[PDB]
Design a protein around this ligand. Structure first.
Ligand SMILES: CC(=O)N[C@@H]1[C@@H](O)[C@H](O[C@@H]2O[C@H](CO)[C@@H](O[C@@H]3O[C@H](CO)[C@@H](O[C@@H]4O[C@H](CO)[C@@H](O)[C@H](O)[C@H]4NC(C)=O)[C@H](O)[C@H]3NC(C)=O)[C@H](O)[C@H]2NC(C)=O)[C@@H](CO)O[C@H]1O
Ligand SMILES: CC(=O)N[C@@H]1[C@@H](O)[C@H](O[C@@H]2O[C@H](CO)[C@@H](O[C@@H]3O[C@H](CO)[C@@H](O[C@@H]4O[C@H](CO)[C@@H](O)[C@H](O)[C@H]4NC(C)=O)[C@H](O)[C@H]3NC(C)=O)[C@H](O)[C@H]2NC(C)=O)[C@@H](CO)O[C@H]1O
Lengths: 538, 538
């Protein structure tokens, strides 16, 4: 007669292809990529003949087989594809095979194949849009926003985006390489801990706790291998297979390392580490380079060289070559983007007409044109055009787009920036004809998280009432609120200025719109980005 | 400044003092009693000075301490008491100690200290009673009832009992020692597998899957160490701290080994294994001996000796001595009981007037007086008295009680048996004056699970309607149903006969009532046991 029916032993059923060390703070030790997950299963036979061969099946297919030598057995084998499997133990003899009931086993991987789709309801004022315009609709999500700002991946209105960028992936390096981090308490040290034993110029993760270990919706079980932002992004990719999720390298305080990349030894090491990062974290779809900025004038006053433009063009061509190789290895399309200054003095330091051939999209940072960093020359921080009182204004969106077009950049590559936050000053005084922008300020406006910067949510929630004046400048295409008693002035984007940017993109055949930063919107800004580009509601 | 605040690493938080091998079918390998659980905790420090000393606290008390030498650490230590603890990791230096948030850890033990109370709602017709009569209200639960009968520990109306007996714990032994098991397919083999490598005459668990591994309400997590009947009984003891839960050794098919216990070498080995079993499974409160029966005439026709009475008295005295020692070692009260034949021919083979001094209670099996085992001499199987048509009837409850009293047994030791099932015959014919008990039968009645035996639930649900006659014999104090067309006759207890037994117990100052078997009642029988003994509703 056939063997008796085995009973699968109680035991762990959760396994991973990319293992995470739960007691590691250095990136080198934190993740281990294997070619396959090590899986184990045991069984007991409470009644009958134990058979002569025991097998482990996954969805009916043999993953292991060996001699059946007693009432209990154990099998160890490898599983090289992530997902959930119905696993059975079958005992066979010449008279037949008898299979156990199935037990589900989970085989984790960083594409999120083991995870349920994170498909959460839209919050605040976000309304549903269908990405059918063919235009980019992007936004940045910040790693550290999960703490005070309490804005996690399950709160991103993901169906309303084509591109979701993660700021920021740091480049390892200590003294003289990431000195701009020292301006932020504990930040430089944090990177040195993450990069312990790791060469400089290789990428890492700045805050491994936020990126991978903090419990978040959908990834709360103790043995869920990937938690934090990366575990939720993987689940988000299961929910939105076409959303492009790009890791952004750099930003204001993590850009110093780019200034050393004129040394091809360092550049090659960096590019190779980006390739490894994408092989490790499969939910990511390319790389965004946010170098602020070629030529200097970024956070570090001691960096910047006339050689930076060349280095930027080389870097893009080599990134593209690496991504093209990864692309054919995997059958996937990988994207290469960059967030750049929108000021013509900085644009002119790079030959974008050449670099564009390596890039899918150029995220023109048409924001922060003005702000509390300059208390004497006030102006709209993210306007489309110059204002009527100063038609010579250098820093406007159109001027940055025009600088790119004048180099020969194709219009379709250019993605216009929208601000989901305002910049502002306090004590504004000595202005003429009721236009506060003609005076000078005494300091920054009180921000939501930091001086001189205010979330759009707070502008709409608190500064559109009481003594606050509201004006929409139709020449510049920019809103601003002003409190005459304290002289507080805030410049930002609102639904109408975003609609003007969107119409401008469609008229000039530009690539779409992107924003900084997603946690600060209440929905009004992203709704307008979507509507103004022609995306159908629903 | 004090050290930074550590983050407890994700990891297993469930540990056990008595470990269970998930891939073991032999009792020797299945459970491992340790003096303490091996616990482990790891931690990372994402910000700050790591301190110079790291400590693991349980409810604020140090369980481990060692030098803090880096950003991550691991501690291994022992916990010798079951329960749930709030565990913290603190990093200290001369300037202060900084403790992590707490993480609960579970330390399992077999008293059920790690489990939530299994306090389930009464089902079917069971109504709530308060054990305030001072009388025993007992019932047996069968290990194998969790399969076809689907009657699990969460279905026991536990608040309505003083004593819950578990049938049955087997005594290891193969050929010539447990031959009565061979009458049940796979049963003898099952015991040989459980007892592999274990000496004969030591106790074991007959079906380890039902007793410890089958998922049941309250004990379904893969890493819950104790599942099955024993895990639920532990949780039941957390819910009913005063309920006495006794393991019963023997029964109809596991009694053969007792017949060899005239050899003190074997008897001592048995008693020592009972002590070990109670040290291992702390939720149990003593031991019930169900030897059927001293003198033979049990399942095995080749066993029985005139020496059995002596062996029984010795066994009880030695069990009592072992329990008295365990009792003072633990501060607990342990009970020693026995289920015995109620026929005077069998009672007379034992000097109960002597054995009673070692026993807390005598469970008089005043049932199975008659049944399909004898097709020619029909009669009430569990009546209080003889019927009017045969006032010389030997097997009645009163006669068994009277045999005990005549030896000198104290009335308070005697617990009267009630049947939660009926016995019956088919083809009953040749009876006079409409009393079916005067005829003879052609075979057994069709049972619920086995021939000639019917659950009371089924008697009430199916055989109290249609062609079935119902009669209550007030002389005997016994109900019976009869189907004249097929000649099917069933004898059992009902609420009224149980009330007569209960009044009899109170009148004669007996110890209380017990029943066989709890899964077969729909609530009517246990309700009456409780009411008739004077227990207040509620
Ligand atoms: C003496 C003084 O008055 N000098 C003035 C100049 O400083 C000034 O030009 C503006 O200069 C500031 C630097 O202080 C600069 O603002 C940095 O701007 C970048 C964007 O280009 C920001 O970075 C990106 O966006 C967010 C923030 O918006 C970053 O946090 C993120 O890392 C980056 N990524 C993305 C995708 O957004 C920096 O955050 C920001 N830093 C500070 C300190 O604010 C403006 O870009 C400069 N503007 C131009 C047009 O160059 C000049 C012009 O107003 O006036 C001089 O007087
Ligand atoms: C030739 C023939 O006709 N002989 C008749 C005799 O057999 C007979 O006496 C009765 O004999 C049967 C044995 O066949 C016996 O029934 C065994 O009874 C015990 C209880 O005493 C049962 O065991 C316990 O209870 C349940 C069952 O009710 C068990 O399953 C459990 O293991 C035990 N524990 C508890 C707590 O309950 C046996 O299950 C049962 N076995 C069978 C096969 O049914 C009766 O006890 C005998 N009665 C007396 C008074 O001795 C005799 C009397 O009717 O008639 C002869 O003719």
């Amino acid at each position: 007669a056939a063997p008796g029916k085995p009973t699968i032993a109680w035991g762990n059923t959760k396994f991973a292809i990319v293992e995470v060390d739960q007691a590691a703070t250095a990136y080198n030790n934190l993740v281990k990529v294997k070619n396959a997950a090590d899986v184990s299963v045991s069984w007991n036979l409470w009644n009958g003949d134990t058979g002569t061969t025991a097998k482990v099946l996954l969805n009916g297919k043999e993953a292991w087989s060996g001699p059946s030598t007693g009432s209990s057995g154990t099998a160890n084998f490898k599983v090289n594809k992530g997902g959930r499997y119905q696993m059975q133990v079958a005992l066979c003899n010449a008279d037949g095979c008898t299979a156990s009931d199935a037990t589900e086993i989970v085989v984790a991987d960083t594409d999120g194949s083991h995870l349920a789709p994170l498909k959460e309801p839209l919050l605040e004022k976000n309304k549903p849009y269908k990405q059918n315009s063919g235009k980019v609709v992007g936004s940045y999500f910040v790693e550290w926003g999960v703490y005070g700002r309490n804005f996690t991946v399950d709160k991103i209105p993901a169906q309303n985006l084509t591109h979701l960028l993660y700021g920021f992936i740091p480049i390892c390096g200590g003294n003289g390489i990431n000195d701009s981090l020292k301006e932020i308490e504990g930040s430089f040290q944090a990177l040195q801990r993450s990069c312990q034993g790791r060469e400089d110029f290789k990428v890492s993760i700045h805050d491994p706790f936020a990126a991978l270990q903090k419990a978040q919706k959908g990834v709360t079980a103790w043995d869920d291998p990937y938690k934090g932002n990366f575990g939720q992004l993987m689940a988000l990719k299961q929910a939105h297979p076409d959303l492009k999720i790009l890791p952004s390298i750099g930003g204001w305080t993590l850009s110093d390392p780019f200034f050393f990349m004129g040394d091809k030894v360092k550049r090659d090491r960096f590019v190779g580490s980006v390739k490894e990062f994408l092989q490790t974290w499969k939910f990511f779809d390319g790389v965004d380079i946010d170098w602020e900025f070629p030529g200097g004038k970024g956070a570090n006053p001691n960096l910047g060289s006339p050689q930076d433009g060349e280095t930027y063009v080389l870097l893009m061509k080599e990134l593209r070559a690496m991504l093209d190789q990864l692309s054919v290895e995997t059958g996937r399309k990988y994207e290469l983007t960059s967030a750049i200054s929108a000021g013509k003095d900085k644009i002119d330091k790079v030959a974008y007409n050449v670099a564009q051939n390596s890039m899918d999209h150029i995220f023109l940072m048409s924001y922060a044109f003005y702000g509390a960093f300059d208390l004497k020359n006030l102006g709209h921080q993210t306007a489309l055009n110059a204002p009527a009182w100063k038609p010579d204004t250098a820093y406007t969106t159109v001027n940055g787009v025009n600088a790119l077009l004048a180099q020969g950049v194709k219009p379709g590559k250019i993605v216009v920036g929208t601000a989901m936050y305002g910049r502002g000053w306090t004590g504004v005084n000595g202005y003429q004809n009721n236009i506060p922008f003609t005076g000078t300020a005494t300091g920054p406006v009180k921000g939501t998280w930091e001086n001189g910067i205010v979330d759009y949510r707070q502008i709409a929630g608190q500064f559109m009432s009481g003594e606050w004046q509201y004006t929409y400048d139709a020449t510049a295409e920019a809103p601003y609120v002003f409190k005459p008693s304290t002289g507080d002035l805030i410049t930002f984007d609102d639904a109408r200025s975003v609609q003007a940017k969107g119409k401008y993109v469609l008229d000039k055949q530009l690539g779409g719109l992107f924003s900084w930063e997603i946690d600060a919107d209440n929905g009004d800004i992203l709704n307008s980005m979507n509507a103004s580009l022609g995306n159908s509601a629903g």
